[PDB]
Design an enzyme around this catalytic site. Structure first.
Site, PDB file in Angstrom:
ATOM      1  N   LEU I  33       0.831  -1.198   0.000  1.00 22.02           N
ATOM      2  CA  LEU I  33       0.000   0.000   0.000  1.00 22.02           C
ATOM      3  C   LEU I  33       0.869   1.253   0.000  1.00 22.02           C
ATOM      4  O   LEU I  33       1.880   1.328   0.704  1.00 22.02           O
ATOM      5  CB  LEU I  33      -0.924   0.011   1.220  1.00 22.02           C
ATOM      6  CG  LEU I  33      -1.981  -1.084   1.406  1.00 22.02           C
ATOM      7  CD1 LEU I  33      -2.797  -0.832   2.659  1.00 22.02           C
ATOM      8  CD2 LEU I  33      -2.885  -1.192   0.202  1.00 22.02           C
ATOM      9  N   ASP I  34       0.459   2.250  -0.780  1.00 27.16           N
ATOM     10  CA  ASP I  34       1.209   3.493  -0.880  1.00 27.16           C
ATOM     11  C   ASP I  34       1.077   4.309   0.407  1.00 27.16           C
ATOM     12  O   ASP I  34       0.276   4.001   1.294  1.00 27.16           O
ATOM     13  CB  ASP I  34       0.726   4.310  -2.077  1.00 27.16           C
ATOM     14  CG  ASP I  34       0.725   3.512  -3.368  1.00 27.16           C
ATOM     15  OD1 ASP I  34       0.913   2.278  -3.310  1.00 27.16           O
ATOM     16  OD2 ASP I  34       0.533   4.118  -4.442  1.00 27.16           O
ATOM     17  N   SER I  35       1.894   5.363   0.507  1.00 26.85           N
ATOM     18  CA  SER I  35       1.764   6.300   1.619  1.00 26.85           C
ATOM     19  C   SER I  35       0.368   6.915   1.644  1.00 26.85           C
ATOM     20  O   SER I  35      -0.301   6.956   2.693  1.00 26.85           O
ATOM     21  CB  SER I  35       2.836   7.394   1.520  1.00 26.85           C
ATOM     22  OG  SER I  35       3.022   7.854   0.182  1.00 26.85           O
ATOM     23  N   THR I  38      -1.962   4.270   2.762  1.00 22.93           N
ATOM     24  CA  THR I  38      -1.921   4.090   4.207  1.00 22.93           C
ATOM     25  C   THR I  38      -2.801   5.113   4.903  1.00 22.93           C
ATOM     26  O   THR I  38      -3.561   4.771   5.822  1.00 22.93           O
ATOM     27  CB  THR I  38      -0.485   4.190   4.716  1.00 22.93           C
ATOM     28  OG1 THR I  38       0.290   3.118   4.173  1.00 22.93           O
ATOM     29  CG2 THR I  38      -0.461   4.108   6.225  1.00 22.93           C
TER      30      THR I  38
END
Ligand SMILES: CCCCCCCCCCCCCCCCCC(=O)OC[C@H](COP(=O)([O-])OCC(O)COP(=O)([O-])OC[C@@H](COC(=O)CCCCCCCCCCCCCCCCC)OC(=O)CCCCCCCCCCCCCCCCC)OC(=O)CCCCCCCCCCCCCCCCC
Ligand SMILES: CCCCC/C=C/C/C=C/C/C=C\C/C=C\CCCC(=O)O[C@H](COC(=O)CCCCCCCCCCCCCCCCC)COP(=O)(O)O[C@@H]1[C@H](O)[C@H](O)[C@@H](O)[C@H](O)[C@H]1O
Ligand SMILES: CCCCCCCCCCCCCCCCCC(=O)OC[C@H](COP(=O)(O)OCCN)OC(=O)CCCCCCCCCCCCCCCCC
Ligand SMILES: CCCCCCCCCCCCCCCCCC(=O)OC[C@H](COP(=O)(O)OCCN)OC(=O)CCCCCCCCCCCCCCCCC
Ligand SMILES: CCCCCCCCCCCCCCCCCC(=O)OC[C@H](COP(=O)(O)OCCN)OC(=O)CCCCCCCCCCCCCCCCC
Ligand SMILES: CCCCCCCCCCCCCCCCCC(=O)OC[C@H](COP(=O)(O)OCCN)OC(=O)CCCCCCCCCCCCCCCCC
Ligand SMILES: CCCCCCCCCCCC(=O)OC[C@H](COP(=O)(O)OCC[N+](C)(C)C)OC(=O)CCCCCCCCCCC
Ligand SMILES: CCCCCCCCCCCC(=O)OC[C@H](COP(=O)(O)OCC[N+](C)(C)C)OC(=O)CCCCCCCCCCC
Ligand SMILES: CCCCCCCCCCCC(=O)OC[C@H](COP(=O)(O)OCC[N+](C)(C)C)OC(=O)CCCCCCCCCCC
Ligand code: SF4
Ligand code: SF4
Lengths: 190, 112, 233, 61, 60, 78, 128, 123, 71, 340
Positions: I33-35, I38
């Site tokens: 999952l990307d920042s 998240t």
């Protein structure tokens, strides 16, 4: 003398410090007179009397449109294109009005007339862009474009306020006499 | 705050766009001293990405002027407490007083 | 200068209006100046201290109400204000009532100056007498070749202004009105920024109106003498 | 030169009135207080006389 | 003190005559105050479109 | 925690003179924070003047403080 | 059926008739934008009830005791002659007792809304 | 004095890209959290997920900008937009500028190839 | 209780293994999952439970286990 | 029955048309105080202006806002108008010449009057706006505050009379109008009546508030007509209270001598003439009080809410309590307690 960070004009003037506010005990008026003024609303009654005096004066109203407010020879109202006494148009399409127009309200087209004259084939004023400043009338070298004193030309549709050359020439023909009064009164001042 | 200057009133802050310069924008401050009856002007420079220090800490009146300078030109003022558009429409894209912004803009409105 | 000269019967009519405007002012003062309700709405409402007035950029009455005697007509005289006699009213409480008194006194001083101008109006031209700047009179324009050329050029290109810049200010009715104009030497100004006193006054609103009641806010807006074409130009 | 220009009169215009002109009018406040006292006292005289006579009419009825 | 009160007959406003003038003087807060109505024969007469001076005006 | 109550005083309001949007925050009676929103009459005059000759730009000054026209003209002229 | 009762019936009838005429003759074209509350031309967010000042509560609450005080004098003014001097003394005592409460209200400044924000009056001191 | 308004952040240009990354992710969180408030203020037809999707697309657009100064400006303007939306300063008309796709089909003919563009003089 | 968190974080895109949600699974390491992703999942959690989570604590969350430990 | 119907129709027509022409009179009187003309164009001399406004409003669409209790917003102005008009049933234009000759007429006046705050109170609740609720709250507070003042003056007057019959109260003033011994009460009653009708300078709610025009901001059509009519009807009715409490009602002067010269016996001519004289006296007093309402509107700026609450509770009410003390004391000192 010699000032440091200052000058004579930045010195406080004589009497700039205000006098101390007076206390209640140093009052000239006794408490009963002040209470009379306080409870009987003296200055409010003076104000009411001033208002009532107006009620017996002549009112300022005029009964438009049966009467009319003052109008002067310089007044800037609806535009018109004028003629010479011979009936020839005065406009020779120099386009100075179009150049000066602060609102870019004038659109002009010209070419040589079949008799050789320099004349407009299109002269349009967007009256909804115009600011009625009179600059076109000042700029014109032959007194062709003018503002009449007419203000009563409200319309029910906006399309009626895009004046083409026929409309403006008809306005000149319609209003020439009033235009001549205004010119006879103000031409020396231009 | 110096005794010989005493320029207590801030008169205006604006920007001027000079597209030929490496730093586009010159920021202009005008000040008045009622004490000495004197005016003075102060200039600095900025670009579309390098901010200027806000002078709101020194003059409260500067607040709105810096906002206008941001709205018209895009100059940022570091330390400005509340820096947002003051003139243009909400969500307006562009800074209209730049020499490359066209006179009538990019968008118009109507009722749909 | 001005675009045209005054018409023939104007000074007399201005004088006759002036002979009665004083009474017109007295009757407004009869309604307001001593009215206890007017004082309830204005006294100690929208107070500004002198130091804060200077720091906020206020000018005109907004400044003179706080006790500071500053007025561009006396401090930096322009067109003919050095040649006429008038007084400057200065407040001391920095509130709406002091500012009202200042404006009412300024009425009277303007009447004074208007009378002096009606008495001292001199003869001569009303615009600068150089036809490279202002247009020549029409009878020259239709008779003289130089006049026609200059008229044509002024109405099509405009005069060229020497390159440079200025900030110029006057004591406008609402305070100090300034323009900062930058000329690039052409016929069109390179930059023109308008310094409106109402802009700075409305900026100071949040500092002045805090802790007041809502009708006090209405009164404060009225005391700032705001016109919004000035505010957002 | 200058021909036909609007100009002021040779002697000038008569001075206009520009200073505040709100002259004080009315009796001193205590005169109004005395008049109010007199009006109220006379009214009380009449009202109490009327009440007393009304009571005697009540007795007769 | 220049600027002080001047009488009502030196102000270019209509005002009242006869018995009504006596009534107005008895009943006015300030008898020297004008009514504000300009004197019709005197004010803005002749009209700006019929000034004789227009036919002698020269560029100054 | 004090919770402000937020009112739009204007623009369509007699005191707000049709064009001022004065966003006020009140705790009961008192104004605690005031935020005047303007630009409801921003016409882009300063942008327009740059495309005008000086003579053509003069009438824009009439329309700034539009009860004080001649003094506006005067400052530009000076 | 005297004039009193007929008049009292007649008034609401006329009100209802005017209402009915308006319903019958005016157009009725609701739509979403027209149905919005008018707040200066904008829209505001729905908010928790405003916090109010205590004086707002106090005027309405104190209306009731003062109103009852005033209305308790009606039996006195309708019986003044019958109770003459004894009742005059009694009503004076009653009024004085209520005036003590008025005094309490006045001295406690109970209906004054105090402007919370006040100008700062502290001196400026510099530690040299 | 002249005090700041609801959700106002003083302008600070981050000296480092990591210290800006923290602020940026916080702004993204603020937008995602305000999405339901936005849907209530602006009386929108579409769903809360659509708003959050749009917010993600906006933040995605600048995912590869390198110069620190440009990122600082993008952040300061994004915060201005957040303050404008959350305070109801925007009306519905300007808020819906962000959702052009949410409006219905504008017509039968949106050209994609050369010939269709050429028949409409858009080649 | 944790099953509600698993349900919230299961209905998201970019993850092809719904059964990969183990009680100690890290979003950036396992889920990929990307920042931004998240932040989205943290917001979805706090919305599902109706609780507001402060900035520092929200940023320090990096995995399912920390989500339950805070839940 | 027939006579009853004719009398009610005459009284009702006179009241409703007097209310209609009061609005025209206010416009004209304000105008001439402001050096203008006022309505002189709709009808001859502008005499049909009010009827034009009424017909226009009767043809105007009713809007029910979305968050609004539509029933409450349409019935609140209706009840305010109904109570306002019901108040007229006890006003006499001559001895016993009234629709309702009640021995409890004063009490009727006070009770119907106290039903006058519900319009302001319910109008704000009509919508779901907090601006509206605050404005309605303030207007209600002002209304009950000055209700106290008016009730106190009523009771002070009844101290002189010991009757709740309005005709009797008027009849006792054949010796002196009660405004003569109690002139400060005339001033206070007028001030409080202006405040109780929420007229300028006591018009906080409509002219300095969050909503642009009071709690009638949302009203269009016939509800607006109801509020407007109720307001002007209450102006005239509260002035009639002033007239019979302090101005001697329908009394002008003793015309016994003139009538004995004119007539030699009772006839419908002498009865009509006496009725005309009495009604004209009361009418001219009402005219002066209406003119005073308009004049005070012309002369003054507005109070704030705080100012007016202070005026009622800190300045006026303590004076009225002092008067509560001093009037029975004067009656006791001189042995002048009124009999029943
Ligand atoms: C106790 C102390 C007694 C001292 C004493 O003997 O004074 C005598 C006193 C004159 O002494 P003063 O106080 O020095 O007044 C002289 C000034 O020139 C005051 O005269 P004025 O010319 O300045 O103005 C007089 C005018 C004040 O009002 C005006 O100036 C114009 C009003 C126009 C009235 C339109 C109707 O009188 C009024 O109208 C006041 C009544 C307002 C309602 C009518 O005369 C009287 O006693 C007359 C009393 C009348 C009572 C009427 C009040 C009700
Ligand atoms: C002398 C006159 C007395 C002086 C003053 C009193 C008023 C006089 C003016 C008299 C008439 C003019 C006003 C008439 C008028 O605008 O309604 C026009 C129609 O127009 C006619 O054709 C509908 C026929 C109109 C019936 C006229 C009845 C006149 C006497 C009324 C009692 C507009 O309603 P409309 O079509 O939307 O029709 C209806 C109507 O408004 C509502 O009752 C319905 O419930 C609603 O559904 C709506 O659709
Ligand atoms: C000398 C001994 C006296 C013995 C006791 C007196 C007996 C009773 C006298 C009868 C009159 C009493 C009622 C009026 C009292 C008004 C007092 C007053 O000034 O109120 C002031 C009040 C502010 O309060 P305060 O703090 O005390 O003022 C200080 C301001 N720096 O702010 C205010 O409320 C302003 C005043 C209110 C005025 C209301 C105006 C409404 C309409 C005006 C009516 C005028 C007449 C209209 C009729 C037309 C004329 C024919
Ligand atoms: C004395 C004159 C009395 C006239 C009253 C007659 C009322 C007729 C108007 C009507 O038909 O009902 C209107 C009422 C409006 O309410 P609604 O439409 O439900 O919601 C709108 C919110 N924007 O719609 C309603 O909900 C009806 C409420 C009242 C119910 C009465 C039913 C009338 C049926 C007509 C036959
Ligand atoms: C009823 C609601 C509240 C009643 C209000 C009371 C008002 C009042 O005081 O009524 C008095 C009046 C008769 O009283 P009185 O003065 O003694 O008449 C003698 C005249 N020579 O009464 C009248 O003149 C007429 C009666 C009015 C009240 C009748 C209402 C009927 C109540 C029954 C409702 C049925 C359900
Ligand atoms: C603001 C509005 C104020 C207007 C008040 C006007 C007052 C003038 C009428 C007073 C009426 C009254 O109550 O008594 C009048 C009465 C008339 O006498 P008469 O007709 O002959 O009948 C004899 C039987 N008693 O008996 C009298 O004639 C007594 C003398 C008249 C009352 C005293 C009048 C002097 C003071 C007037 C001040 C009024 C307020 C200012
Ligand atoms: C419809 C019919 C018209 C009614 C209009 C009212 C006209 C009032 C004229 C102003 C009088 C005035 O205000 O007098 C002002 C005086 C104050 O005088 P001073 O400033 O101290 O002067 C001092 C300098 N001296 C004395 C040397 C000249 O007030 C008072 O002390 C008490 C207030 C009395 C006014 C009560 C008015 C009653 C009217 C009721 C009906
Ligand atoms: C605190 C108040 C102190 C006031 C003292 C004043 C006394 C002056 C002497 C004159 C009396 C007189 O001689 O007139 C007597 C009058 C009327 O009675 P009569 O029918 O004419 O007498 C005949 C006696 N029979 C009937 C038995 C045959 O009686 C009064 O009530 C009038 C008193 C004057 C009014 C005082 C009120 C003061 C204002 C009160 C405001 C609160
Ligand atoms: C008390 C009533 C007195 C007023 C009546 C005279 C007005 C008038 O009759 O005026 C003439 C009216 C129309 O008025 P207009 O169109 O405005 O012309 C006025 C000319 N102007 C514009 C120059 C001023 O003719 C009519 O239809 C009269 C029928 C109206 C009956 C309703 C009367 C209500 C009672
Ligand atoms: S009046 Fe001014 S704006 Fe109008 S057409 Fe002439 S130059 Fe253009
Ligand atoms: S109207 Fe006059 S200025 Fe304009 S094009 Fe014609 S001749 Fe030239």
């Amino acid at each position: 003398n010699i000032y440091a960070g200052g000058s004579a004009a930045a010195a406080p003037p004589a009497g700039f410090r205000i006098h101390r506010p007076a206390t209640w005990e140093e009052s000239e008026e006794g408490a009963l007179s002040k209470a009379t003024k306080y409870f009987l609303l003296a200055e409010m009654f003076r104000g009411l009397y001033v208002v009532l005096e107006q009620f017996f004066r002549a009112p300022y109203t005029i009964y438009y449109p049966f009467e009319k407010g003052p109008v002067s020879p310089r007044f800037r109202g609806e535009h018109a294109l004028r003629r010479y006494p011979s009936g020839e148009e005065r406009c020779i399409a120099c386009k100075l009005c179009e150049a000066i127009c602060p609102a870019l309200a004038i659109t002009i087209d010209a070419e040589e007339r079949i008799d050789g004259s320099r004349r407009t084939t299109k002269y349009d004023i967007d009256m909804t862009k115009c600011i009625y400043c009179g600059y076109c009338q000042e700029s014109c070298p032959v007194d062709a474009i003018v503002e009449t004193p007419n203000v009563e030309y409200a319309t029910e549709t906006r399309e009626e306020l895009l004046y083409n050359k026929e409309k403006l020439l008809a306005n000149g023909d319609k209003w020439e006499l009033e235009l001549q009064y205004a010119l006879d009164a103000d031409a020396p001042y231009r | 705050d110096n005794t010989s200057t005493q320029y207590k009133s801030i008169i205006d802050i604006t920007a001027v766009d000079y597209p030929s310069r490496e730093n586009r924008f010159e920021v202009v401050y005008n000040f008045l001293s009622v004490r000495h009856n004197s005016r003075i002007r102060l200039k600095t420079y900025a670009t579309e990405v390098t901010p200027v220090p806000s002078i709101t800490c020194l003059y409260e009146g500067a607040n709105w002027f810096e906002r206008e300078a941001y709205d018209m030109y895009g100059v940022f003022f570091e330390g400005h407490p509340d820096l947002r558009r003051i003139m243009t429409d909400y969500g307006f894209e562009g800074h209209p007083l730049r020499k490359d912004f066209p006179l009538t803009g990019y968008t118009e409105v109507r009722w749909d | 200068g001005v675009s045209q000269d005054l018409p023939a019967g104007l000074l007399d009519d201005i004088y006759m209006w002036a002979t009665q405007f004083g009474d017109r002012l007295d009757e407004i003062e009869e309604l307001l100046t001593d009215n206890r309700i007017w004082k309830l709405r204005t006294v100690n409402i929208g107070t500004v201290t002198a130091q804060d007035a200077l720091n906020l950029g206020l000018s005109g009455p907004m400044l003179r109400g706080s006790g500071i005697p500053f007025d561009i007509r006396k401090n930096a005289p322009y067109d003919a204000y050095d040649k006429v006699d008038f007084d400057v009213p200065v407040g001391m409480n920095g509130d709406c009532y002091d500012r009202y008194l200042i404006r009412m006194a300024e009425f009277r001083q303007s009447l004074r100056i208007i009378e002096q101008c009606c008495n001292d109006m001199p003869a001569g031209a009303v615009k600068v007498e150089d036809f490279k700047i202002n247009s020549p009179p029409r009878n020259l324009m239709k008779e003289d070749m130089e006049a026609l050329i200059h008229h044509f050029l002024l109405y099509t290109k405009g005069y060229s202004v020497p390159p440079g810049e200025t900030y110029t200010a006057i004591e406008a009715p609402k305070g100090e009105m300034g323009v900062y104009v930058v000329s690039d030497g052409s016929e069109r100004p390179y930059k023109c920024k308008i310094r409106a006193p109402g802009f700075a006054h409305l900026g100071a609103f949040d500092h002045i109106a805090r802790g007041h009641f809502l009708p006090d806010a209405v009164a404060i807006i009225g005391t700032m003498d705001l016109v919004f074409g000035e505010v957002d130009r | 030169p200058s021909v036909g220009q609007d100009l002021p009169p040779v002697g000038g215009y008569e001075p206009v009135q520009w200073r505040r002109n709100l002259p004080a009018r009315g009796f001193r406040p205590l005169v109004y207080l005395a008049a109010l006292c007199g009006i109220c006292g006379y009214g009380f005289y009449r009202a109490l006389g009327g009440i007393q006579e009304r009571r005697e009419l009540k007795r007769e009825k | 003190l220049p600027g002080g009160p001047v009488p009502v007959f030196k102000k270019y406003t209509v005002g009242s005559k006869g018995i009504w003038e006596k009534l107005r003087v008895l009943l006015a807060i300030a008898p020297n105050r004008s009514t504000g109505n300009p004197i019709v024969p005197l004010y803005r007469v002749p009209t700006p479109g019929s000034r004789p001076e227009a036919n002698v005006y020269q560029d100054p | 925690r004090i919770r402000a109550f937020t009112i739009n005083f204007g623009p369509q309001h007699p005191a707000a003179h049709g064009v001022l949007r004065l966003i006020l925050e009140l705790s009961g009676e008192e104004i605690i924070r005031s935020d005047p929103h303007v630009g409801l009459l921003h016409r882009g005059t300063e942008k327009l003047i740059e495309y005008k000759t000086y003579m053509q730009a003069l009438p824009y000054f009439d329309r700034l403080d539009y009860v004080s026209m001649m003094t506006n003209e005067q400052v530009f002229s000076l | 059926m005297n004039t009193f009762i007929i008049f009292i019936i007649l008034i609401p009838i006329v009100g209802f008739a005017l209402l009915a005429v308006n319903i019958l003759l005016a157009v009725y074209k609701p739509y979403n934008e027209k149905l919005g509350a008018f707040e200066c031309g904008l829209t505001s967010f729905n908010q928790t009830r405003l916090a109010f000042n205590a004086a707002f509560i106090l005027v309405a609450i104190l209306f009731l005791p003062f109103d009852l005080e005033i209305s308790t004098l009606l039996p006195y003014v309708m019986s003044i002659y019958l109770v003459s001097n004894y009742g005059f003394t009694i009503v004076l005592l009653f009024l004085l007792i209520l005036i003590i409460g008025f005094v309490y209200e006045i001295n406690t400044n109970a209906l004054k809304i105090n402007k919370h924000n006040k100008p700062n009056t502290d001196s400026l001191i510099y530690k040299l | 004095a002249i005090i700041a308004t609801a959700f106002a952040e003083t302008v600070k240009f981050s000296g480092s890209k990591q210290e800006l990354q923290k602020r940026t992710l916080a702004l993204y969180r603020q937008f995602l959290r305000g999405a339901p408030t936005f849907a209530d203020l602006y009386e929108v037809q579409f769903s809360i997920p659509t708003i959050r999707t749009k917010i993600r697309q906006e933040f995605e657009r600048h995912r590869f900008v390198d110069d620190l100064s440009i990122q600082n400006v993008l952040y300061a303007k994004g915060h201005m937009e957040y303050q404008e939306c959350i305070n109801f300063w925007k009306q519905q008309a300007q808020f819906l500028k962000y959702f052009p796709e949410e409006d219905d089909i504008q017509g039968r003919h949106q050209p994609s190839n050369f010939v269709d563009k050429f028949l409409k003089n858009r080649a | 209780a944790e099953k509600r968190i698993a349900a919230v974080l299961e209905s998201f895109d970019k993850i092809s293994n719904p059964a990969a949600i183990t009680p100690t699974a890290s979003f950036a390491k396992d889920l990929n999952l990307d920042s931004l992703d998240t932040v989205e999942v943290v917001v979805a959690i706090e919305e599902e439970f109706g609780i507001e989570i402060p900035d520092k604590e929200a940023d320090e969350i990096k995995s399912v286990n920390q989500a339950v430990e805070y839940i | 029955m027939i006579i009853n119907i004719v009398e009610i129709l005459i009284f009702l027509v006179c009241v409703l048309f007097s209310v209609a022409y009061l609005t025209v009179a206010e416009r004209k009187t304000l105008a001439y105080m402001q050096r203008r003309l006022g309505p002189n164009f709709v009808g001859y001399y502008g005499l049909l202006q009010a009827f034009a406004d009424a017909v226009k409003l009767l043809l105007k669409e009713i809007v029910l806002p979305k968050e609004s209790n539509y029933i409450i917003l349409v019935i609140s102005p209706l009840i305010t108008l109904i109570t306002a008009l019901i108040g007229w049933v006890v006003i006499p234009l001559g001895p016993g010449i009234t629709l309702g000759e009640l021995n409890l007429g004063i009490l009727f006046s006070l009770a119907i009057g106290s039903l006058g705050v519900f319009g302001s109170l319910l109008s704000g609740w009509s919508s779901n706006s907090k601006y509206s609720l605050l404005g309605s709250i303030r207007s209600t507070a002002q209304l009950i505050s000055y209700e106290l003042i008016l009730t106190s003056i009523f009771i002070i007057i009844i101290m002189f009379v010991s009757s709740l019959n309005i005709t009797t109260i008027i009849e006792t003033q054949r010796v002196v109008w009660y405004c003569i011994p109690l002139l400060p009460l005339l001033l206070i009653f007028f001030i409080a009546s202006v405040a109780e009708t929420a007229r300028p300078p006591f018009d906080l709610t409509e002219s300095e508030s969050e909503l642009v025009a009071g709690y009638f901001t949302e009203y269009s059509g016939s509800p607006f007509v109801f509020f407007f009519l109720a307001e002007y009807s209450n102006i005239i009715l509260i002035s009639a209270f002033n007239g019979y409490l302090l101005l001697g009602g329908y009394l002008s002067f003793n015309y016994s001598y003139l009538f004995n010269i004119l007539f030699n016996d009772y006839s419908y001519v002498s009865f009509l003439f006496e009725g005309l004289i009495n009604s004209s006296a009361y009418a001219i007093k009402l005219v002066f009080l209406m003119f005073s309402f308009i004049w005070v509107r012309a002369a003054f700026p507005r109070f704030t809410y705080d100012n007016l609450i202070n005026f009622c509770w800190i300045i006026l009410l303590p004076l009225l309590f002092g008067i509560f003390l001093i009037i029975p004391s004067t009656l006791y000192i001189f042995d002048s307690f009124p009999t029943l």
